[PDB]
Structure 1
Amino acid sequence: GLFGAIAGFIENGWEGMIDGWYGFRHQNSEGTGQAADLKSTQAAIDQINGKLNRVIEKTNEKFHQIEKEFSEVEGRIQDLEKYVEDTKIDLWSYNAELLVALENQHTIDLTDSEMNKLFEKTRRQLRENAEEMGNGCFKIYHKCDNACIESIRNGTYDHDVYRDEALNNRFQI
């Protein structure tokens, strides 16, 4: 993908995450846990649904047309009737082939994009209290209990509360 997250710096996906498309796994002093991020999941789903709604259930109504099967050979007019229809089908077949190719390439890039957006959104919250391990995981440099982890996940994490503690752990051996 264009953003290098899915099938990129995130090595692989999670079969165990059945309640969402994107999410968090953590390890803290209280143990380990998993939770889906609903906002990013919904962003991807909404876009795909919109895309899907533009493609599906839009059909034109045609009634009397030309004939397309013939029981006798007739020559010039029948040649033209057959050629018109064959020309039409090929052009529509091309349209269909290109449509799916463009759409699918885009769907992959868009989902890749949302993964990356969630990563950057989280990075930004954490400010100087965390570093990036390069595999989609942050090392948070302070004691961060289940409440603290949930505060990151629901976007209310206050970096100032933990900054002194984090800066101390980061820049000291």
Structure 2
Amino acid sequence: GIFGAIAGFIENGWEGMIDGWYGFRHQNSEGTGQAADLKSTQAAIDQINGKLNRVIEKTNEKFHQIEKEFSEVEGRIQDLEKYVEDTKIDLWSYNAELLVALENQHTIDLTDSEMNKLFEKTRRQLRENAEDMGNGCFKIYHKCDNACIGSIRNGTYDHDVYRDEALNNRFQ
């Protein structure tokens, strides 16, 4: 993907994350656990639904048209009728092929984006209290219990509370 997160610096996805599309796993003094991030899951899904609504959209309505099957050889005028239909089908076939390929490239890129946005939002929250370990994981340089982890996921983690402790651990 164009951001390098999914199938990039995050080695692989999590089959055990069954209640969201993106999320956090943590390790701390009390153990390990997981949680979905709703707002990024919803972002990816909303975009994808936007794209579905545009495509699953009302088919045109046509009634009487030209004929497209013929029981007798007639020559010039039937040549035309066939060429007309064959030309339309090829054009529409091309459109459908291109559409699906563009959308799919964009779908894979936008979901990559969201993963990357969530990571960056997290990196920003932690300030000087953590280092990026390169695989999508943050080493956090202070005691960080389940509530603390919870505040990181809520967006109410106050880095100044932990700053003297983390800076001390980071630089020795």
TM-score category, normalised to shorter length = over 0.9
RMSD, aligned α-carbons: 0.4
Deviations 1:40-60 (A, max 9, x none): 000000000001100113211
Deviations 1:142-170 (A, max 9, x none): 00000000100111110000000000000
Task: Tell me the alpha carbon deviations over residues 72-101 of structure 1, each in whole angstroms, 9 at most, x when there is no partner.
Answer: 110000000000000000000000000000
Q: Which moved more, 1:49-58 or 1:100-109?
A: 49-58
Output one character per residue of 1:24-45: Cα deviation in whole Å (capped at 9) or x when no partner: 0000001100000000000000
Give the aligned partner of residue 140 of structure 1.
140
Which residue of the partner structure matches residue 30 of structure 2? 30
Please give the secondary structure, in 1, of the residue aligned with 2:23: strand
- Show structure 2 runs of 5+ residues with no match: none
Rounded Cα–Cα distance in structure 1 between residues aligned with 2:57 and 2:50: 12
How many residue pairs end up in the alignment? 172
Structure 2 length normalisation: TM-score? 0.99
Distance 1:151 1:52 in 2: 35
SS state at 1:62 partner: coil
Secondary structure of the residue aligned to 1:4 is coil
**Secondary structure at 2:134 match in 1:** coil
CA distance in 2 between partners of 1:83 and 1:25 (Å): 60
Say which SS state the counterpart of residue 15 (structure 2) adopts: coil
1:55 matched to 2:50? The reply is no
- 1:114-171 C-alpha deviation (Å, 9 max, x unpaired): 0000000000000000000000000000000000001001111100000000000000
| Percent identity over paired residues | 98
- Secondary structure at the aligned position of 2:139 is classed as strand
